[PDB]
Design a protein around this ligand. Sequence first.
Ligand SMILES: O=C(O)[C@H]1[C@H]2CC[C@H](CC2)[C@@H]1Nc1nc(-c2n[nH]c3ncc(F)cc23)ncc1F
Length: 277
Amino acid sequence: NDDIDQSLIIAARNIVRRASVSADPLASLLEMCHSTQIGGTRMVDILRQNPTEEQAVDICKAAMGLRISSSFSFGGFTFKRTSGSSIKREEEVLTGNLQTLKIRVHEGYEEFTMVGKRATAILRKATRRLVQLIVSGRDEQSIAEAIIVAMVFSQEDCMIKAVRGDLNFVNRANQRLNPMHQLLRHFQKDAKVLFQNWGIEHIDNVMGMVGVLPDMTPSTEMSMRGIRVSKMSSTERVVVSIDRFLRVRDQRGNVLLSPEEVSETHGTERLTITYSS
Ligand SMILES: O=C(O)[C@H]1[C@H]2CC[C@H](CC2)[C@@H]1Nc1nc(-c2n[nH]c3ncc(F)cc23)ncc1F
């Protein structure tokens, strides 16, 4: 039933936002999920039996020890590893404003699939290197957003040095964002410099694959390095941890979800959401 899911998501998102601004968001979130009711039934009972995988929903599921999708969310996009592997190595890099950031750099060749509300992509990358990106979204803006995420996700030096400012982004709870999100929010405010310094190259026009330029204009002759455009599976469930501030981590310690990665809501629920604590 799609009506339950639509309302569950709407409820989950509101709960995570309202909990995130608490002193102990995890406690606050557990209180809200126990008493809030969707269409009569208690929410806890829905999470236990509902198959929906969503950022806010999987946060709530994780909060009560339920298995969730191994995939992780970054910049709104759901990354699933199709091939390859990497390992973590806390490096320290230098931005284009001489600000130092301690970043978890991933070493190894990986293949991914990015999925978003308004764009998808296949992303090949390796140690601080974007090999290939085949984005395919709704329109210009939705596709640019997907490329910005890919560039920041790649951890390439040109992207790091493309920073032109001091990164002091905070969240609803007025806490500093972790490095990778600091970079992301900066290049979402304006990706002008990022796209210039990324670099262009000559492309060999193949069907479907169309190139794109730093101004977001196509070309069958030249495109940006590794980035192509186009037009148009199973789920592994795994145990996950959650801490005070609703940061969900897999066993290997990588942040799968956080309040920072939940979308905004439309708030036209088909079922009855009574928010009790
Ligand atoms: O590293 C983390 O703790 C999180 C942070 C928020 C989302 C992202 C990006 C940073 C990351 N989560 C995860 N990242 C990765 C990953 N694999 N290969 C990568 N290359 C660069 C990168 F940058 C992250 C990754 N694999 C599993 C994850 F679960």
